[PDB]
Amino acid sequence: ETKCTLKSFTVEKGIYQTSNFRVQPTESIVRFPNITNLCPFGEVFNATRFASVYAWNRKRISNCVADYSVLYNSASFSTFKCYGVSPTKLNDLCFTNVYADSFVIRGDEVRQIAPGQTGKIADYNYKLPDDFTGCVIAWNSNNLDSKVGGNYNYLYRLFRKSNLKPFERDISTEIYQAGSTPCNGVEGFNCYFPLQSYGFQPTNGVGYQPYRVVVLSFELLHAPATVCGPKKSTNLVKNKCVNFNFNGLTGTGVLTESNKKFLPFQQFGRDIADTTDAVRDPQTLEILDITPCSFGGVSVITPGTNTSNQVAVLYQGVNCTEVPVYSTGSNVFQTRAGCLIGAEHVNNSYECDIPIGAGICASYQTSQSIIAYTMSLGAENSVAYSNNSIAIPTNFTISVTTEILPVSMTKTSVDCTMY
Amino acid sequence: AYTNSFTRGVYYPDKVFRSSVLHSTQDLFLPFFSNVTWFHAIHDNPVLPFNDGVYFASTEKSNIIRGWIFGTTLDSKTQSLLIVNNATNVVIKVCEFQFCNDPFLGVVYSSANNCTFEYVSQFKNLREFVFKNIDGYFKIYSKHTPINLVRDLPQGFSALEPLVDLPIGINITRFQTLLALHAYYVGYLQPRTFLLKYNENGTITDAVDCALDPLS
Amino acid sequence: ICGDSTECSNLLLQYGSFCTQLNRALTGIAVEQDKNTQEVFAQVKQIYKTPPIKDFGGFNFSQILPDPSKPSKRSFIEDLLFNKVTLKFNGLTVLPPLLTDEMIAQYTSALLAGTITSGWTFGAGAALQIPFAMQMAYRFNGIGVTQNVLYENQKLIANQFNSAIGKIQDSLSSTASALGKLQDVVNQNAQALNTLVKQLSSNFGAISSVLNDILSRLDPPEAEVQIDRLITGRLQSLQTYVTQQLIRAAEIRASANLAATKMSECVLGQS
Amino acid sequence: ICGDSTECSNLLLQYGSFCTQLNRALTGIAVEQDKNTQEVFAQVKQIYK
Amino acid sequence: EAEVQIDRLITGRLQSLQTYVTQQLIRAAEIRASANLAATKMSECVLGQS
Ligand SMILES: *[C@@H]1O[C@H](CO)[C@@H](O[C@@H]2O[C@H](CO)[C@@H](O)[C@H](O)[C@H]2NC(C)=O)[C@H](O)[C@H]1NC(C)=O
Ligand SMILES: *[C@@H]1O[C@H](CO)[C@@H](O[C@@H]2O[C@H](CO)[C@@H](O)[C@H](O)[C@H]2NC(C)=O)[C@H](O)[C@H]1NC(C)=O
Ligand SMILES: *[C@@H]1O[C@H](CO)[C@@H](O[C@@H]2O[C@H](CO)[C@@H](O)[C@H](O)[C@H]2NC(C)=O)[C@H](O)[C@H]1NC(C)=O
Ligand SMILES: *[C@@H]1O[C@H](CO)[C@@H](O[C@@H]2O[C@H](CO)[C@@H](O)[C@H](O)[C@H]2NC(C)=O)[C@H](O)[C@H]1NC(C)=O
Ligand SMILES: *[C@@H]1O[C@H](CO)[C@@H](O[C@@H]2O[C@H](CO)[C@@H](O)[C@H](O)[C@H]2NC(C)=O)[C@H](O)[C@H]1NC(C)=O
Ligand SMILES: *[C@@H]1O[C@H](CO)[C@@H](O[C@@H]2O[C@H](CO)[C@@H](O)[C@H](O)[C@H]2NC(C)=O)[C@H](O)[C@H]1NC(C)=O
Ligand SMILES: *[C@@H]1O[C@H](CO)[C@@H](O[C@@H]2O[C@H](CO)[C@@H](O)[C@H](O)[C@H]2NC(C)=O)[C@H](O)[C@H]1NC(C)=O
Ligand SMILES: *[C@@H]1O[C@H](CO)[C@@H](O)[C@H](O)[C@H]1NC(C)=O
Ligand SMILES: *[C@@H]1O[C@H](CO)[C@@H](O)[C@H](O)[C@H]1NC(C)=O
Ligand SMILES: *[C@@H]1O[C@H](CO)[C@@H](O)[C@H](O)[C@H]1NC(C)=O
Ligand SMILES: *[C@@H]1O[C@H](CO)[C@@H](O)[C@H](O)[C@H]1NC(C)=O
Ligand SMILES: *[C@@H]1O[C@H](CO)[C@@H](O)[C@H](O)[C@H]1NC(C)=O
Ligand SMILES: *[C@@H]1O[C@H](CO)[C@@H](O)[C@H](O)[C@H]1NC(C)=O
């Protein structure tokens, strides 16, 4: 690593920085509000009676937390196919509101409910707009409609030349007599009732069995979100590097117990620069502290490739109990500036060679090993000062010393347009 | 008559705990040393403009000042809010009511056409309220604790904490108080800049304006 | 810049090798600070010790010499100075200095014991013992006042010096705000670091200042554009901080060179 | 940068707080020049004639 | 679109060149200070006695 960083095949005695290490995370945790208001969908699908196709029933629903996965896996439906929206993702979307349309159709009219389609009820009873609708759910109802249902309680409208606009109900019961020239040239005759009855019999087939049908249309991005899908949760752990959510505020760190006191209305504290420091979860309503996971750069102390081929590894500013060959290694020496591994420790003290920090340094100088010691400021002596004693030199030596001072450097110019 | 608002009208803007930090905020508040239109409805509730959230006050500790009616037409044409009390709890409904000339309330109801939402919740004592509206969120703050710093005047320093937040999303430009059958300040809010000092427990203890005096 | 995100690292690795430059500059200034302290303080080749008995012709140095009673072996004025002046989130670290406080105190005590017992001869060879009075005689002879003056008015000089040192101790103890320069240096460093970490939460023209939400909210096609804007803003801010640090380091280096010259000239000799 | 504009100030305040440190540095160098002149020239306590 | 690509190249290279010239100015100032110290030492310790 040192050779890669220095980009050379020879290195000199000293300390170098190679890279940095960061503790890897672990399993994630997610928390969410404790209770969820269940949307009353039992009265929608398990309804006593559904009106006729020309007078189908409306419902507006919002401010709900309803799970659709618990309904998709249900096999009590003749057909459950949805348009443009993946049902498996319905738990990860939020909508302004939802509109439910309930009615009952015949067995062979299932294909008539689709955008851009042609048919009697498709264009004259309920026209689906030329855009995305939520989707249609249909299920058999011969148990409750083809056996004990009303003989003519279910009706359709055989009124033509009045192609209805999308989301339009014409419940006006008017006898269809034109009263003008284009009906046998007579007024009053050719009068046919706009409505007609379904023909159903006990076990009459497949295309005549009445089917209960609900059409769901979701309004998206038209207003602030009001209805959303429920989200699961999990348990928590302590004293481990974890990535967490806590109701929306994702972050990585280690969890601890805190003594801080929140007022009954805050959500999460901080200290400065948006750095979250304390969070409180809804299920337990307990305040807890967040501490960033440990990290830091590593360094290598080497005596030079020319001399030998052994190094000592220093981790900077980390409690060396959890560093994870260098997972157990040689004698770990924890100092004030991290921990040093690969070198021995002595109580002796000599001159400093390769500075490290915190008043200690490592070298091989006072067998064939690196030793880290506490540097010594120099020799030690005392002079016997007394009030009537003097010391006068008698011999002298002249010496020569050398000093080097730079005075100049290279003069360069850089072209602008060419470069 | 008119009254001078010494220091009233500072509240918690967000829901973030803080400790021993001098935090500068840029949010619409009540300017210090402002004018408030004191009313004397004793032996009269005129109509007032809304103008992006209002202060409110009172000083009577009995069951007279009960209801708030909000809206822009005060008719069944447009939905009208209604906040009242029946000695135990509070109802909030965005359903439509018809006009009331002299409604009477205390321990009015005209029509319920297009009723869509419902909500149920829980020296004298002065009850401060602040009504705010931001992007379809209607916020109501409250304070029910008085300070006897001076007599006959509400001088001192106090904060306000949110209690009701509603994601209804309607635009209101008119509001009236309601009484029974047989005295409150009003102020407006402006987008000023404030500096807030938090106590060791996270409670506001001192607020200073940023656009009042050179020393400020 | 990235905060452990794959796409941020992928986008960042194509901008070149500026990080090598930033790390090299920071390591250079750190080594410069270490060598600067080493040069300003390490000026002796031994560590002298004062004799157990003290009779300096009437003077009283008890308030300057190190006190063994204190665990740090620091004199009274040192304690007053330390008690007077007062002062790892997202990838920032503070390395510890090479020389701790105890070795600095030992160096200062060595310098002071050498300048008391020996005078100026301990800076030009081997230290030579010399009585204190016959050192003030030489120092007076230096400035043109003949040495006859000192031996005739020794008690007055001792009393004046003791009164002056008591006065200076009282002035340090009572009047504060006499240590402005160090306080300003520390405050400027803290303010620069604090504003650098504050600049991280700014929007910088993107949709939001949080990278995880902006990556998980939209599809890549505009996500790389938003991430690019955030990256370039943060990089420019970091560059500004580095330049400020370089300027301040150069200024401190000049001041410390002046201090080293003053110490080497006035302490070890006569000016 | 803006010159008496409304939205330009809105975009400018979104970029952070550069102007704070810019003005701080400029005021610092101004005060430094003042102290510099005072220190180089004012070297006596009395005035002689 | 070629102009967009050329714009990106230009802004990147301009930033790099600015950084280089700033570093160069700092180094030049430091060397000038050292040279002034050397000139003082030469003029004082050689032509006379210190
Ligand atoms: C209509 O009722 C049936 C019967 O209750 C519901 O089917 C599930 O029935 C089991 C056993 O009775 C219950 O434990 C489940 O809770 C029922 N499902 C749900 C989603 O509640 C059926 O779901 C009902 N139809 C609805 C709710 O639309
Ligand atoms: C949040 O929901 C959980 C689970 O329903 C509640 O935890 C239970 O609370 C009851 C209270 O009597 C205890 O008897 C149970 O032992 C608890 N179970 C667990 C697994 O902790 C909790 O009380 C709810 N908290 C709130 C504020 O609603
Ligand atoms: C590394 O962490 C350990 C904790 O596992 C620290 O151990 C401490 O040891 C002292 C002395 O016995 C105890 O008084 C503390 O209570 C221990 N800490 C804890 C959290 O219990 C150890 O000191 C740490 N190392 C460094 C260098 O900080
Ligand atoms: C001058 O005399 C003093 C005291 O007699 C000497 O100091 C001691 O000398 C002896 C020599 O046997 C050493 O063992 C002691 O360690 C010295 N004491 C101290 C405190 O260092 C001093 O060495 C003499 N000077 C010379 C040049 O001989
Ligand atoms: C001062 O020291 C010098 C050497 O540092 C002494 O000169 C040496 O004297 C011895 C004995 O006569 C010779 O063997 C050496 O060859 C000499 N060395 C040199 C370099 O000339 C000198 O004698 C000493 N003077 C006194 C007065 O002690
Ligand atoms: C902050 O909250 C605490 C506890 O809720 C309040 O209680 C005081 O806490 C301090 C600190 O330990 C104690 O010295 C007092 O004796 C406590 N007083 C009482 C009556 O319990 C405290 O009053 C709140 N405010 C402040 C400023 O601390
Ligand atoms: C030298 O000065 C010290 C000042 O620290 C003197 O110590 C003080 O002496 C007075 C007089 O008795 C006491 O009241 C103080 O409590 C002492 N201070 C300390 C810190 O001990 C010391 O007496 C002086 N000695 C000489 C010989 O002048
Ligand atoms: C290796 O180091 C030794 C001692 O420092 C030296 O004598 C020798 O020349 C060095 N070898 C090389 C190839 O530099
Ligand atoms: C230093 O001495 C102490 C005390 O005897 C001992 O416990 C310790 O192991 C010694 N250190 C080494 C490196 O031998
Ligand atoms: C309201 O403002 C007017 C000036 O416009 C002032 O004269 C009056 O005193 C104010 N009312 C108060 C302070 O109650
Ligand atoms: C008002 O009184 C009626 C009478 O019982 C009660 O139903 C209603 O709940 C009261 N108001 C509120 C807000 O609860
Ligand atoms: C109720 O509101 C709806 C809007 O969704 C409107 O179509 C209808 O006419 C309203 N009802 C009355 C009686 O005004
Ligand atoms: C806002 O007010 C306008 C009237 O100016 C109204 O048309 C609009 O519906 C209001 N918006 C909401 C969300 O109520």
* Amino acid at site E8: R
Q: Which of A380, A381, A382, A395 to mutate to test the pocket of ligand 4 (most atoms within 8 A of CB)?
A: A382
Q: How far is B3 from chain A (nearest CA, A)?
A: 32
For C183, the 3-state DSSP assignment is helix
Span from the CA of A113 to the centroid of ligand 1 (angstroms): 26
- 8 Å CB contact between A280 and A286: yes
Phi and psi for A342 in degrees, rounded to 5? 100, 0
Q: How far is A266 from chain B (nearest CA, A)?
A: 4
Q: Is B2 in the pocket of ligand 10 (CB under 6 A)?
A: yes
Q: Is B169 in the pocket of ligand 13 (CB under 6 A)?
A: yes
- 8 Å CB contact between B119 and B54: no
| Domain boundaries, position B27 | 2-216
Sheet holding B204-209, edge to edge: B22-25, B194-198, B204-209
- 8 Å CB contact between B48 and B187: no
Q: Which atom of ligand 6 is nearest to the CA of B199?
A: 27
Most A CBs within 10 A among B12, B17, B199, hence the mutation to make, goes to B17
- 8 Å CB contact between A195 and A155: yes
State how far the alpha carbon of B145 is from the alpha carbons of A384, B124, B126, B158, in Å: 79, 10, 7, 9
CA distance B70 to B91: 14
* Of the candidates B185, B179, B208, B182, the residue with the CA atom closest to the CA atom of residue B130: B185
Residue with tokens 């020799």: A379
* Of the candidates C206, C243, C248, C246, the residue with the CA atom closest to the CA atom of residue C227: C206
Check residue C91 and report its DSSP letter.
Answer: S
Span from the CA of B169 to the centroid of ligand 7 (angstroms): 79
Spell out the long-range contacts of C255-263 with Cβ–Cβ below 8 A and sequence spacing 24 or more.
C256/C36, C256/C40, C259/C40, C260/C39, C260/C40, C263/C40, C263/C43
- 8 Å CB contact between B147 and B158: yes
Which amino acid residue places its CA nearest to atom 14 of ligand 8?
A306
CA distance C136 to C149: 11
Q: What is the dihedral of CA C256, C259, C261, C262, to 10 degrees?
A: 180
Q: Concatenated DSSP letters for C105-163?
A: HHHHHHHHHHHHHTTTGGGSSS-----SHHHHHHHHHHTT--TTTGGGSHHHHHHHHHH
* Of the candidates A90, A36, A101, A44, the residue with the CA atom closest to the CA atom of residue A63: A36
- 8 Å CB contact between B158 and B133: no
CA distance A305 to A6: 13
* Of the candidates A350, A401, A398, A383, the residue with the CA atom closest to the CA atom of residue C126: A383
Q: Is A336 in the pocket of ligand 3 (CB under 6 A)?
A: no
Rg value, chain D, Cα: 20
Which amino acid residue places its CA nearest to atom 11 of ligand 10?
B2
User: Cβ neighbours of residue C163 under 8 Å, at least 6 residues apart?
Assistant: none
Which amino acid residue places its CA nearest to atom 28 of ligand 4?
A391
Q: Which atom of ligand 6 is nearest to the CA of B201?
A: 1
Q: Concatenated DSSP letters for C21-38?
A: HHHHHHHHHHHHHHHHHH
Span from the CA of A34 to the centroid of ligand 2 (angstroms): 9
SS3 content of chain C, % helix, strand, coil (to 5): 65, 0, 35
CA distance A325 to A328: 7
What are the counts of helices (DSSP H) followed by strands (DSSP E) for chain A?
4, 23
- 8 Å CB contact between B166 and B92: yes
For B28, the 3-state DSSP assignment is strand
Whether residues E31 and A414 touch (CB distance < 8 A) is answered with: no
Please give the distance of CA C65 from its chain centroid, rounded to a whole number: 22
CA distance A294 to A207: 69
User: Cβ neighbours of residue B127 under 8 Å, at least 6 residues apart?
Assistant: B57, B58, B142, B143, B144
Please enumerate residues of E whose Cβ is less than 8 A from a Cβ of C: 12, 16, 19, 22, 26, 29-30, 33
Span from the CA of B51 to the centroid of ligand 13 (angstroms): 14
Tokens of D8: 């330009």
CA distance B133 to B170: 9
- 8 Å CB contact between C99 and A356: no
Whether residues E19 and C16 touch (CB distance < 8 A) is answered with: no
- 8 Å CB contact between B32 and B56: no
Residue with tokens 């992928």: C10
For B204, the 3-state DSSP assignment is strand
Resolution to one decimal, Å: 3.6
Instruction: Cite the beta strand spans of A106-209 per DSSP E.
Output: 135-140, 155-157, 195-197
The continuous run of DSSP H or E covering B54 comes out as strand B54-56
- 8 Å CB contact between A104 and A53: yes
For A174, the 3-state DSSP assignment is coil
Angle, CA of C126, C130 and C132, to the nearest 5° = 135
Q: Closest-CA residue in chain C for E12?
A: C15
Q: Which atom of ligand 2 is nearest to the CA of A284?
A: 25
Please give the distance of CA C105 from its chain centroid, rounded to a whole number: 13
Whether residues A383 and C127 touch (CB distance < 8 A) is answered with: yes
Q: How many domains in chain B? A: 1
Span from the CA of B65 to the centroid of ligand 10 (angstroms): 26
Method used to determine the 3D structure: cryo-EM
The continuous run of DSSP H or E covering C41 comes out as helix C18-41
CATH code of the domain covering residue B51: 2.60.120.960
Which ligand gives the minimal distance to the CA of B185? 10
Phi and psi for C122 in degrees, rounded to 5? -80, -5
Q: Which of A10, A12, A306, A353 to mutate to test the pocket of ligand 8 (most atoms within 8 A of CB)?
A: A306
Please give the distance of CA E26 from its chain centroid, rounded to a whole number: 5
Alpha helices (H) in A231-303, listed in sequence order? none
Q: First and final CA of chain D: distance in angstroms?
A: 53
Residues C202, C208, C213, C216: is their CA dihedral positive or negative?
negative
